[PDB]
């Protein structure tokens, strides 16, 4: 009934996409009133 | 007008002190005020089929678990020729009841009796 | 063993009581046979407390079987004497009799012997408490970090 | 069980007393049967002190259904013997009678057996007092910042 | 319960005593009913010592109601057996009888069970004395605190 100290590891995950995706943290104080939404301009033509 | 009353014709056989049917019990019908199980005192019995065939069977009538008489696994209606005395025994073999004089007339087949009796 | 049915147990009990035996020229009455069979069923149901009492192997009849007598009781070869002696003691008061002191002593001895093996089997020791170490002498139950006993 | 109603209980008690049974040539009046069933109901209600006494499964009949006689009792297969032995003892004085020693002994044994499992269930230890600490080796308590035991 | 009146209690008492029952062939005489009702009222008033005795729910009559018999007693289901057993014991000597050992034992047991719950309720622990500190481990919890228990 007494087990042993050796966990049979099974899975191995890899995170390429979310590790090369840029992460942004806009100011939370502003975002609370702004309803979790922020606008950024687009290159002018 | 009223001509026929809805009722069931199937008899029920229960115990004497409790409300439970005499299961796999036996019925002996013989002459009045006698000992029915003695084969000398018994009288003929007849299954009255749906078409009134009157087919005779042996004496010890077997009771279902519901109190209804059976024969070959099907409920039957049983008639006699005369007033009889009844001995109802339980499955173990105990005497559930003994009655010296019981008489009940067949309620059906009035047409044939009237045919014979009344005047043309 | 020629005692194999509930009816056989009932007949032995009645003979032991003297109510209905072939050594007294009396025959068993079916009304008393049904009563004694009911008494035996109730007594064994009281003994075998739904799996926590005296284990005998006695088989309890079902209702779809109309006649209780004539069924094998299922007891082992050695429970027969205890069962029918206790039955005689139980059913004596119906006839305003008193089972003799020999029958009472045999019933007591039989009930004790009936429960003896179950008592030995149920006299089991508890596991170690979960707050009690396993020691370091138990090398295997360590180096697996089993420093304390499992418990429960 | 062949005994499935309060009337069966009373009939078994009468049979054990010897006052009446399926074999007797004289029987008791239905008024006597109703009185005995009322006594059984009173004794069962006394045993079951509104949930703080003996638990058996007895189903107390309601006045709306006319015959309290004829209702299923609801007792388990192992309580019937105790219940009707105690009933025989209780209603014996009606018939200028005194239950015999075997009946009294079986009644006492049956009542004890009836209460055994409820007694084991009610042998429950109390929680730790509100002032007893949890210790420092109590990791679960250390998580929840419980230095002292909850007082319940 | 089929016993819901003082007359029903008295009738049960007499039936137990063997004075007036259908187990025998005797009928209840109205003089016996009246005397036994008066005895029941006196015994209940003796028990319930104006609130400082046995609490049962018994409802005491008034002079305005002419027939005392015919009213509900008000007792709970579990008090009826004790009440009528003790009533039978009390009213036995009027007929130069002595209630049998079973009735005496059942009356004792019933009275004990009657007072059991009241005893559990009344087993109360008095508060701390007037000259007892409440401890330094309490004030920090209740910044107001008091240093000493009030008492009473």
Rg from Cα of chain A: 22 Å
Largest sheet of chain A: none
Q: What's the helical proportion of residues of chain A? A: 10-25%
Strand order of the largest sheet of chain B: 6-5-4-1-8-9
* End-to-end separation of chain B: 26 Å
Helix content of chain B: under 10%
Oligomeric state as shown: part of a larger assembly
Q: In this structure, how is the largest beta sheet of chain B organized?
A: 6 strands, antiparallel
Helix count, DSSP H or I runs of 4 or more residues of chain B: 1
Taken in chain order, the helices and strands of chain A follow as HH
Query: Which radius of gyration of chain B do the C-alpha atoms yield?
Result: 16 Å
How much beta of chain B, percentage-wise? Answer: 25-35%
Principal-axis shape of chain A equals: elongated
Distance N terminus to C terminus of chain A?
A: 73 Å
Q: What is the SS-derived class of chain B?
A: mainly beta
Largest interface: D-E, 30 and 29 residues
Count every beta strand of chain B, where a strand is a DSSP E run of 2 or more residues.
9
Number of strands of chain A: 0
The fraction of residues in strands of chain A falls at under 5%
Number of helices of chain A: 2
GO molecular function (chains C, D, E): hydrolase activity
Protein name (chains C, D, E): Head-to-tail adapter protein gp4
Subcellular location (chains C, D, E): Virion
Subunit structure (chains C, D, E): Monomer; homododecamer upon binding to the portal ring. Interacts (via C-terminus) with the portal protein; this interaction participates in the head completion. Interacts with the Tail hub protein gp10. Interacts with the tail needle protein gp26.
């Amino acid at each position: 009934t007494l087990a042993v100290d050796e966990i049979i590891e099974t899975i191995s995950a890899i995170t390429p996409m979310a590790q090369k995706a840029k992460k942004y943290t806009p100011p939370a104080a502003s975002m609370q009133r702004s309803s979790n939404t922020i606008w950024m301009p687009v290159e002018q033509e | 007008t009223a001509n026929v009353v809805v009722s069931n014709p199937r008899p029920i056989f229960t115990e004497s002190r409790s409300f439970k049917a005499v299961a796999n019990g036996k019925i002996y019908i013989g002459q009045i005020d006698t000992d029915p199980v003695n084969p000398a005192n018994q009288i003929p019995v007849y299954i009255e089929n749906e078409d009134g065939s009157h087919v005779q069977i042996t004496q010890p009538l077997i009771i279902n678990a519901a109190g209804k008489i059976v024969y070959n696994g099907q409920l039957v209606k049983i008639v006699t020729v005369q007033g009889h005395s009844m001995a109802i025994y339980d499955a173990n073999g105990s005497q559930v009841d003994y009655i010296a004089n019981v008489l009940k007339y067949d309620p059906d087949q009035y047409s044939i009796e009237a045919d014979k009796k009344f005047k043309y | 063993m020629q005692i194999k049915t509930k009816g056989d147990l009932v007949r032995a009990a009645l003979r032991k009581l003297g109510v209905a035996s072939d050594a007294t020229l009396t025959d068993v009455e079916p009304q008393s046979m049904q009563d004694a069979v009911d008494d035996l069923e109730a007594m064994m149901a009281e003994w075998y407390q739904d799996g926590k009492g005296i284990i005998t192997g006695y088989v309890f009849s079902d209702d779809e079987n109309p006649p209780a007598e004539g069924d094998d009781h299922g007891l082992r070869s050695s429970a027969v004497s205890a069962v029918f002696h206790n039955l005689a003691c139980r059913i004596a008061p119906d006839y305003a009799l008193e089972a003799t002191a020999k029958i009472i002593a045999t019933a007591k001895y039989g009930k004790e012997l009936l429960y003896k093996q179950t008592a030995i089997s149920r006299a089991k020791r508890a596991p170690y408490p979960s707050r009690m170490p396993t020691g370091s002498g138990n090398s295997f139950a360590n180096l697996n970090e089993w420093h304390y006993f499992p418990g429960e």
